[model samples]
Target: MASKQELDAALKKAKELASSAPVVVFSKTYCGYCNRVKQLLTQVGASYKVVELDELSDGSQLQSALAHWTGRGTVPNVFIGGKQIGGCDTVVEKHQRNELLPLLQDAAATAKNPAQL
Candidate 1:
């Protein structure tokens, strides 16, 4: 868990780009698989933006956007580097195949830093 200050800052940052980011996790409330994805990423110290499509006021629009982003119709669609990583099964499969870790590490390495160094 983040400190109150850190959580506040993260929430602020997350809200600032609620619609877009390099890595996007489209999820929903009351979803076990969604929780699993979040737990997995958090366990590995990965940063991501999760959009709860079910709660969106513009739910249809959000779905359309995610579909366009992933080229598929599914919740929990993930995108890295503006490329679709497919849905839950794809992520788990990639992790099992040892492909997910490297991609995550690369994304971590390439994330923009405040130091710009």
Candidate 2:
């Protein structure tokens, strides 16, 4: 079992990663949902960071810690601005509703003009 300190560290790491980029996706290399999410992001011309969980030996442990933190365990875990944004379906739904593009644009705008916003 992971100690409290370890779990806290993991959650901190996850938050850091998520906030490090406008769009950060925690995914497994072989997951179709992950692929779909990536494609959708690409389709909207948004640049994103991907952490392939399967590529790391501590991947499962991190996933467990993430689930404990966010209440979701499945791959393609998406985050924006340090906020959990749900998985592929949520993203697609947002896109279909014409919300994703504006959200991405706002992130980009803020990144480019941090002093103004």
Candidate 3:
């Protein structure tokens, strides 16, 4: 988890990545939750951009931005189609609740459309 200032800063970094990547996962190098999310996507044969906050030039700033965007200051902020999808716990919850699959499907559809993907 990041401090409030940390997440707010990361939000800005996310904006930069969003311009080039369809999905942005703000994660920490040694975080188990981060690993879990990445594994889930990989298991599904999905590719995504992983932004390691701890490895960024302005790590603290990026974290602050992420906090502002998600209101939770946690690492592993996921954005699909530029939409904030919260953290690992939320992701798992959404999947178990049968909600994430639809969003992923929508993302896949858009991604296949070269113009949008």
Highest TM-score, which number? Answer: 2
Residue-wise lDDT of candidate 3 within 14-82, one digit each (tens)?
677754555678899999999998887776555588988899898767777767666867878888877
User: What are the runs in model 2 whose C-alpha is more than 4 Å off?
Assistant: 109-117
lDDT of 1 at 62: 58
Error of 1 at 71 (Å): 3.6
Task: Spell out the clash pairs found in candidate 1.
Answer: none
Give the Å shift of residue 28 in candidate 1.
Answer: 1.0
Instruction: At residue 67, give the lDDT of candidate 3.
Output: 72
Model 1 stretches astray by more than 4 angstroms: 1-19, 109-117
Every candidate's lDDT: 0.64, 0.81, 0.73
| Cα displacement (Å) at residue 38, model 2 | 0.5
Ranking by lDDT: 2, 3, 1
- Is candidate 1 or 2 superior in TM-score? 2
Candidate 2 to truth, TM:
0.87
- What lDDT does model 2 reach? 0.81
| Candidate 1 residue lDDT tens string, 8-90 | 55444433444366567778887888887777666656677787878966555556655543467577777665456777788
